[PDB]
């Protein structure tokens, strides 16, 4: 029924954003990708070589191999009732560093520094995040101003 074409249904997926066509900015070629870092596979359509398949657009993986123009990415793909880790070669135009790993590394560094500093200062500090707790008990001043009475409006036929 449906064709099996490699770019079927990517009409908007691989298209460029509005007024963002043309020359690829060169910082994307200047990014440094090491083995073990987490990258999101975008898949821009200006460059056709090394393009990922449509099932990897929007997926995140870990770099395991670096070549001259591309990287090898171990990315999970779900095939029916099993998830299996595919290895795909993707040119660096179609990937970027995932910032979730950046934020986590920042938090780890903060935690390590705070633990080392807290042992020296003496007291104990909280390192785990916690879910948003129930709101505390507080007071609400009226400031001598009576709260405004709200009344539902009558119905009127706009147009």
């Amino acid at each position: 029924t449906n064709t099996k074409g490699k770019r079927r249904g990517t009409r908007y997926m691989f298209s460029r954003p509005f007024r963002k066509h043309g020359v690829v900015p060169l910082a994307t070629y200047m990014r440094i990708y090491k083995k073990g870092d987490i990258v999101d596979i975008k898949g821009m359509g200006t460059v056709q070589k090394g393009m990922p398949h449509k099932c990897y657009h929007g997926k995140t993986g870990r770099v395991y191999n670096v070549t001259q123009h591309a990287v090898g990415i171990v990315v999970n793909k779900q095939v029916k009732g099993k998830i299996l880790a595919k290895r795909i070669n993707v040119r660096i135009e179609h990937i970027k560093h995932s910032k979730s790993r950046d934020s986590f590394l920042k938090r780890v560094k903060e935690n390590d520094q705070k633990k080392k500093e807290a042992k020296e200062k003496g007291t104990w500090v909280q390192l785990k995040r916690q879910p948003a707790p129930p709101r505390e008990a507080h007071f609400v001043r009226t400031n001598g101003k009576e709260p405004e009475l709200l009344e539902p409006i009558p119905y009127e036929f706009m147009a």
Binding site: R19, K20, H21, G22, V23, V24, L26, A27, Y29, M30, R31, I32, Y33, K34, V66, T67, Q68, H69, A70, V71, I92
Partner: protein
């Protein structure tokens, strides 16, 4: 009107500008991508290039490597600092291009500390020379030429700058096809007329030719050559001494900063209140003139 306005509102609503330096016409991004981008399996290894830019009155030779925040220039040499030694007039020519390329190479090599090793080619001959790395010593500095938007035909001054750099001791891949000595018909490199160009004997030949043909044209052409007392006989020796003096002391001494009053030569932006008041005044003047009738 009778024709559709092409540059209407929708034209600007959909118009996408090019990169700023493409609009300024200063950068070929097609070449820049191929020329500044490092292989990914080389990681943070700097890729060095020798930018050569010829100006109406100057030659700028720089060595830079690309970074995400912007390019980093590690060594720059100018043709306007040539008058410090030897050569005083007739900059932005092929001989000055060689001199500033040699100066850039010597300055960078001195900064890195590789001068006793990689002395380059001191005795200037136009034949091809390529510096090779010495075992047990730090490797030869490798950089690639960046000509920019210059048309790279035989005899372009970017190749004189490159020749100066490679004789200064910088490993820059090149062929002799684009040097002034190359003959396109025979596909042969003379390497002697190229040396003449390096020593500026085409300019000296022009001077002494005008001395035979037209004296007033000679004055009008080389007016500043009569000043500074530069003559076709001493031209080659002037360039040779400039080469030697580049060799001995290539270190750049920045001129000390000056005490300067904070004078603003540019009109600042009008404030929002000023613009609104200007509109109010213009409306009031129009109404008052209408009442005057």
């Amino acid at each position: 009107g009778f024709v559709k306005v092409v540059k209407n509102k929708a034209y600007f609503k959909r118009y996408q500008v090019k990169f700023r330096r493409r609009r300024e016409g200063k950068t070929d991004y097609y070449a820049r991508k191929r020329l500044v981008i490092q292989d990914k399996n080389k990681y943070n290894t700097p890729k060095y290039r020798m930018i050569v830019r010829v100006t109406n009155r100057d030659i700028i030779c720089q060595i830079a490597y690309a970074r995400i925040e912007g390019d980093m220039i590690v060594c720059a040499a100018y043709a306007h600092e040539l008058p410090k030694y030897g050569v005083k007039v007739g900059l932005t020519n092929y001989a000055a291009a060689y001199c500033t390329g040699l100066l850039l190479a010597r300055r960078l090599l001195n900064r890195f500390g590789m001068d006793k090793i990689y002395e380059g080619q001191v005795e200037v001959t136009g034949d091809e020379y390529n510096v090779e790395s010495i075992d047990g010593q730090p490797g030869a500095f490798t950089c690639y030429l960046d000509a920019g938007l210059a048309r790279t035909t035989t005899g372009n001054k970017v190749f004189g700058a490159l020749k100066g750099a490679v004789d200064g001791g910088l490993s820059i891949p090149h062929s002799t096809k684009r040097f002034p000595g190359y003959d396109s018909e025979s596909k042969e490199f003379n390497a002697e007329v190229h040396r003449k160009h390096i020593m500026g004997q085409n300019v000296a030949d022009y001077m002494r030719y005008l001395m035979e043909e037209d004296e007033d044209a000679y004055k009008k052409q080389f007016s500043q050559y009569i000043k500074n007392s530069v003559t076709p006989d001493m031209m080659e020796e002037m360039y040779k001494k400039a080469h030697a003096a580049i060799r001995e002391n290539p270190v750049y001494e920045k001129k000390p900063k000056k005490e300067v009053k904070k004078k603003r030569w540019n009109r600042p932006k009008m404030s929002l209140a000023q613009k609104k008041d200007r509109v109010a005044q213009k409306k009031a003047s129009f109404l008052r003139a209408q009442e005057r009738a």
